[PDB]
């Protein structure tokens, strides 16, 4: 039985990592859209002040 | 007075007597033997590949 409860966990323990590491990356690109989303937004925002400036 | 023809069937006897233990007992009781090992074996060997 320590034998057979070893082996489940093994294969059960790859099966949670594999979840958990579908959530981390289903977080990371969370944070790469959001990232490039509002930097292009501070782009624009940096663009509209010197313009602004400017004027 | 020993006779050489008793003393061929106390060979005969004998060999009865080996053969048929041998072939009821021993071997079913040296699969016994190789039973303890090999369990013990399997257990060791289980071991350290559960660890």
Same mark, same amino acid.
């Given at each position: ?13 790859? #099966?949670?990592?594999?979840?958990? #590491?579908? &959530? %981390? ?6 944070? #790469?859209?959001?990232? /490039? #989303?509002?930097? %292009?937004?501070?782009?624009?925002? /940096?663009?509209?002040?010197? &313009? /602004?400036?400017?004027? | ?7 061929? @069937?106390?060979?005969? =006897? ?8 041998? @072939?009821?007992?021993? *071997?079913? +009781?040296?699969?016994?033997? =190789?039973? *303890?090992? *090999?369990?013990?074996?399997?257990? +060791?060997?289980? @071991?350290?590949? +559960? *660890?």
């Amino acid at each position: 039985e320590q034998l057979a409860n070893a082996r489940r966990d093994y294969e059960a323990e790859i #099966a949670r990592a594999r979840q958990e #590491a579908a &959530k %981390i990356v289903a977080q990371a690109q969370e944070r #790469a859209k959001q990232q /490039e #989303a509002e930097i %292009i937004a501070q782009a624009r925002r /940096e663009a509209e002040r010197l &313009k /602004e400036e400017a004027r | 007075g020993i006779n050489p023809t008793l003393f061929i @069937a106390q060979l005969i =006897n004998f060999l009865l007597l080996i053969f048929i233990l041998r @072939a009821l007992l021993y *071997r079913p +009781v040296m699969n016994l033997l =190789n039973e *303890r090992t *090999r369990r013990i074996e399997e257990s +060791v060997r289980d @071991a350290e590949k +559960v *660890r």
